[model samples]
Target chain A: XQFEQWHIRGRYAC
Target chain B: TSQLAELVDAAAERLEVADPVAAFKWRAQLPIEDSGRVEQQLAKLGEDARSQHIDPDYVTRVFDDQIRATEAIEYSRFSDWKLNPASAPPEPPDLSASRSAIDSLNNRMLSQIWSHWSLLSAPSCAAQLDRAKRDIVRSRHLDSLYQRALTTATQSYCQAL
Candidate 1:
């Protein structure tokens, strides 16, 4: 769940 | 992401808002001499957000916080290095730290979306893909807000000078 959301969140910044 | 970049580029070009890609890419660190035109562009964006049910006052507050952050950074730098002849400054205040306010807003929005997704599940990666797309669009809007705020901050600094 962490990595899944992490991947999604990462795209939000750049 | 490249997808968001392309969408913004296309929107800017279509709207004929001068150099918006460069403006957002650089986060508007450079002062805009013709701020009136940018002001009009900001109004358009502000309306778009309003139509989407985004809070204008909250957005204003975010921009205000960034402006204050920029001022604080500048004042710290000025106090440390400009007037004192004998004292050696440790280092300059990093102006990029001002972006934390924008970052915080982005994180909160992501969490809000996450909460919405918690109750639902899909058979495939469909839900995940949809979430990803929404995140990109939301991120692009936030970036636009940050850029406008930073640009206003730069203009304020220039006026003070």
Candidate 2:
């Protein structure tokens, strides 16, 4: 597989 | 999602308003960080939020991102222009005008936030924001950084959960 991604940086969800 | 839409639209408009500030900042060789102005605006936003029955602390947090995002946009645009002078806008709107427009937008944004208060605590709100972000990015054709600005923006809203 490859490196995973997360849109985790912004707000709790922003 | 409609509230999310309005939230991001207001964001897009803020970016639009930043066009002039970006241009002026670059042309005048101004730096992006301004502590005093930011502090003053935050105080003003706190007061304004009280009038609408929103918690001053919460409103301040949301606006903190909004303000920072605009600065991020300004810095990003300035960086690009520094690299390629040709990309800058042709004319800067009145710096006064930019703040003036933001005055109205600030109120509208507060309204939307209060209006959408319930959604912030919904279980699906986070996932919805993921899709909503795409819509906002696609609709506006915002670059990655601008998108980041938007993503970080709605932070305060969901904090109520």
Candidate 3:
């Protein structure tokens, strides 16, 4: 099965 | 106080030079169809920078690195990136989808390298500029973390291919 995930290191609140 | 303001002024000057908006203005002033094509590239760059889709340094390079301006701009044109090429070996449907995940990873990784200088773009905003400087340092740390992850993921995917 293929897996994909999207993530950011921290809050992109800048 | 004067010395600190001088320091702030210098950084602000660099930021002005680094701004993509200034670069777009330069491109917009030209009178040619070729320049319009360049404008189209910068137009997307400006929107991406505003939306924080890419790094501030990447945007700055489009102005500072005149020789490689097109290279930098084209690199960030993620929509132009292709995973399946006729020259390359074929992969399973699952592997193709897995490789596609790298694009999202790249975008988020680059997004970590953002800027806060706009908060202090005004003259005499020395105190806020100082704060922006520290925020910039914080951004570097976050960028490193994301870059490390991206490196690992990319290496693994390359090996799989």
Candidate 4:
């Protein structure tokens, strides 16, 4: 699990 | 992922501008005889940056902005200080310590804000903003404490100056 998750979900492609 | 990132990015840009301005003002205020030393110090700072993995171009940009901003700040701050010495201290006290503290706070806050931004939900963003606002208030309170100490010192120094 990434300790520092960015919420780029739905805004940009994974 | 959101607007908060934009806001934080904009603020970081502003701070980049501000950092140079503050540093430049400090460098320019040195006596004419100290110009060589100032240049050396700046160059050394650049070298140190390189050692720490900072790009040369970025360092150059930082130095350029710093010199220009210092000149502007020296002129304006000095004049302002002359007019309001009782209220404003002309130069920062313990430069590195104060600057480092601010830099650390700015870095941490920006990182947190950016992290919160990636979540991209209005409710979450609002909560983040609330947290940020509280953090800002706390930082400001700390600044006020520092300023009060400086003010007391200024008063004492002026009496002897």
**Per-model lDDT:** 0.34, 0.72, 0.31, 0.38
- Report model 4's TM-score to 2 decimal places: 0.33
Model 3 lDDT per residue over B1-161, tens place? 22223322222222222123323323344221243343444345446666865443344333222312222332232222234223222223332433244334323322432332332233544454345434543444424423332222222111100
Docking class of 3: incorrect
- TM-score (chain B only), all candidates: 0.29, 0.87, 0.22, 0.35
Clashing pairs in 1: A14-B1
Q: What is the lDDT of candidate 3?
A: 0.31
DockQ for candidate 3, C-alpha atoms? 0.02
**In candidate 2, which residue ranges exceed 4 Å CA deviation?**
A1-14
Top candidate when judged by lDDT against the true structure: 2
Q: Taking the tens digit of each residue's C-alpha lDDT, what string does model 2 give over B1-161? A: 45577766776677667778888877777777766676678778888878887787778778877877777777788878879998877656457887788988888788877887787668776776676677888888888787788866765567644
Sort by TM-score, best first: 2, 4, 1, 3
Q: What is the TM-score of each candidate against the true structure?
A: 0.27, 0.81, 0.21, 0.33
Pairs in steric clash, model 3: none
Q: What is every candidate's C-alpha DockQ against the true complex, given to 2 decimals?
A: 0.02, 0.03, 0.02, 0.02
> Alpha-carbon error at B133 in model 1, in Å?
27
Interface RMSD of each: 15.5, 12.6, 15.3, 19.1
Scanning candidate 3 chain B in windows of ten residues, the lowest lDDT window is B152-161
Poorest lDDT segment (10 consecutive residues) of candidate 4 chain B: B152-161
Q: In terms of TM-score, which candidate is stronger, 1 or 2?
A: 2
